[model samples]
Target chain A: MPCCQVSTNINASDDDAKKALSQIENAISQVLGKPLGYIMSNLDYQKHMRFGGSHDGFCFVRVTSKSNNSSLADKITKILASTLNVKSERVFIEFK
Target chain B: MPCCQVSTNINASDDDAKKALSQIENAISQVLGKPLGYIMSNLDYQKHMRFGGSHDGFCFVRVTSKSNNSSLADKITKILASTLNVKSERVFIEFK
Candidate 1:
C-alpha cells in the first residue's frame, strides 16, 4: 500500500485543498505504478510551520510504501510546489 | 531529534487542536527522552480516513527518530485516545 500525507502551512479553501489532494493522489499513483483505487492521500494545513528557521510557506510530505525512490520524491516535490504554490526549496519529502 | 505527526479524522476547534498538539509534543519528548526544544509535532485533521474497512474515528501516528521502542507507542496511543477521544483500538502507530 502507498499512503501519502501532506502537511503545509499554505492556507487554502476546502475546495482547493481537496483538489490538491486529488492531484497528489494521482501523482503518487503514477509515480509508484500503483492502482489509483488503493492509493491513500491526506492533506492538512498547519497553522504554524517553519522551514530554514522561517515561517514562510513550506510543505512536508510523508510517504509510506514498500519501496522508496528518489524519482518518487522528485515527482512529489514538483507536484506539491506547483499545486500548492510553494517554492520547491521549501518542500521536504520523507519516505518510509 | 524526534518528530511526531498525527493524522486523524477528529474535528476540533483551533484552540483545541493547538492544545492537543502541545500535549502530544510533551508526550513525544517525555517518551523519547528527547529535549522538548528538539521535538517537532504536528496534528492534521483528515477529512476522510478509513481503517479496517470502516470510516469510524481513527488516529494514525508517525514517529521519526534515530531509534524506536514499543513504550513510546504505548504512551502515544494512551495520550491520543484520551485527548482525542478515539478508541485505543483505532489508534495506529508507525515508527521510522
Candidate 2:
C-alpha cells in the first residue's frame, strides 16, 4: 500500500477540495500505475505552514513509497501547484 | 517553522487524540529543546495504513527538521509507540 499525504497552507472550499482529491488520485495512479484501491491520499488545507521563512501558500507532500525522481517529482509538483494555485517552488515533496 | 506530521492506523477518539497531541507537542519540544511555538504537530489516526506486510496498528511520522539522530529517533519512537499503543518497530519516522 502506498499513500501520498498533502498538507498545504492554501485554502479551498469543500467542492474544490473534492475535485482536487480526484485529480490527485488520478495523477498518483497514473504516475505509479497502481490501482486506486492500493493507493490512498489525504489532503489537509489551511495548515499553518511556512516556506523559506514565509507563511505563504505552500504544500508539503509525503509518499510512503519511493516512486519519485526529478522527472516524476516535476509532474507531481505541477499537478499540486496547479491544483492548489501555488508556485511549483513552494511545493516540497519527500519520499519515504 | 518545523512541523511533524503523524499518520497512524489506530483509531482514537477526539479526547484521546487531543491528549496525544499535547503529549506529542511536549515530547517534540523536550526532545529538540525547541519552543512549543516553533514546533508544530499534526496527528492523523485510523488510516488504512499497512506496515511490515500487515495492516496492523502503526504510525508513520515525519519531521521537517534534521534533528533526528539515532538517539533522538529512538526516543521519539518510544514516545510515539507508548502514546499510540503500538510496538516500537511499528513506528516509522523520517527526518528531513
Candidate 3:
C-alpha cells in the first residue's frame, strides 16, 4: 500500500472537525482496508477581531491515505477522490 | 498582526467538516491578517478495518503558527488558544 490522500476546505465548528475525522476514517476503512490504529487532524482555523469589528475565516485541508491503492481515486467515490471530490486541481495522487 | 482563535465540539458528518472549514476562513478574515493569506490545515483523518468487527476510530487536533501579537487571546475575546478552547488547560497563550 503506497498512500492515498484526500481533503476539502469546509468549516462549522470544533465539533464538526472531530466528526469529519471520524467520517474520513470510516470511509477509508470501508473502501481501503481497516482501522490501522489512529488518525490525526491538525486544525488551522481561528478567529481574530479588532475593537469593534466582526470575525472572519480562511483555511485549507489535507487528508492522506494509507493502503494498497493509496494514491488512487477515492475507492468508494471512484471518480477521483482528490481535489475536493475529484476537483482535479486539489487532488494529488502521490505514491512512495 | 496577531492571531485570535475559537472552536466548538459538534458533528453531523464529514461533509460538515468541509463546510465548517469554510466558515472558519470567513471568520478569520473579518479581523486577523490570516497567515498573510495562507492557512495550512492538516487533516489526519484516515480509515482501515479488519475481520468484520466494524472498525472504529481515535484522533486529535493541533492548530498553531506565525503572527505579531501571536499565541494569545481571541483578540477581541481575550481568551486562550490551545488544546481546544479557553478551558483553562487547552489555552496556551505563549508570547515571545
Candidate 4:
C-alpha cells in the first residue's frame, strides 16, 4: 500500500474533533468524488492504522496516491481550511 | 524507520515538543508491548517516507495490518496523534 498523512496544529477536545473531522472528511470526499467510507477502508489507510500507529496533532496529512495526482493534495488542504477552521499554514503532508 | 506522525495545535515550543514526543513513544509502546526500536525498524512506513513527502494536519489514522497482518499504519498514526494532541480524526494514515 502507498500512503500520505494529513495534519494540523489546531487543538480540539475529542468531541469537537469528531465534528471537525466529519466536516473535513465530507469536504475531501466531495472534492475527490470518493465516499468517506471507501477512503477510510482503503488498504493503505487501514494498514497504516492496524500496525499500531497513533495520532498526533502535527499539521500533516498522509496521501495514499504516490504518483500523478495533482488535485488531491490541494483539495485536501482546501477541505482543512474550509471545513476544519485551520489556516493553510497550520497544515502539512507526508507521502509514501 | 517506519513512521507516522501525531501532531497537535497546542503550540509547544521545540523543547515542549521533545517532551511530548517522548511521552507519546512510551505510551504507544506500552500499548503494543514492544520496544520502540523494534517497532521503528519495520518496513512499509519507512519506504514511503524515504520516497519523500511532507505534512498536513487533519485527524485520521494509518496502520499496516492485514489477514497476514501486513501493515505499519496505526502505531505511527496513534503515536503521532497522541504526541500531537491532534484530536484522533484529524490523523490520517497511508501505508504500502
Top DockQ hit: 1
Which candidate gets the maximum lDDT versus the true structure?
1
Per-model TM-score, in order, reads 0.56, 0.52, 0.29, 0.35
lDDT, residue B93, candidate 2? 79
Backbone clash count, each prediction separately = 0, 0, 41, 96
Question: Order the candidates by TM-score, highest first — what do you get?
Answer: 1, 2, 4, 3
Q: Which residue ranges in model 4 land beyond 4 Å of their true spot? A: A1-5, A41-58, A65-70, A82-85, A94-96, B1-96
lDDT for model 1 comes to 0.75
Docking class of 2: incorrect
Winner of 2 and 4 under TM-score: 2
State the local distance difference test value for candidate 3.
0.36
**Relative to the true interface, what fraction of contacts does candidate 4 keep?**
0.00
lDDT of 2 by residue, B1-96 (tens): 577767788886655555555666666677777677555566665467888778888888887664345655777677777766878888887887
Model 3 docking category: incorrect
Fraction of reference contacts reproduced per prediction? 0.09, 0.00, 0.00, 0.00
Off by over 4 Å in 2: A66-68, B1-96
| B9-42 per-residue lDDT for model 4 (tens digits) | 2444566456545654564456545567744321
| lDDT leaderboard ranking | 1, 2, 4, 3
- lDDT per residue for candidate 2 within A5-69, as digits (tens), equals 87776876777667666777777777778788888887886333444334567787777754345
Give the per-residue lDDT of model 4 (tens digit) for A1-96: 232334344444444444444544554455555555444311122222211143432346665532423555666666566645656655565444
Residue A78 lDDT in candidate 4 = 67
Q: Which residue ranges in model 3 land beyond 4 Å of their true spot? A: A8-85, A92-96, B1-61, B64-73, B76-88, B92-96
Using alpha carbons, what is the TM-score of model 3? 0.29
Report the lDDT of model 3 for residue B61.
32
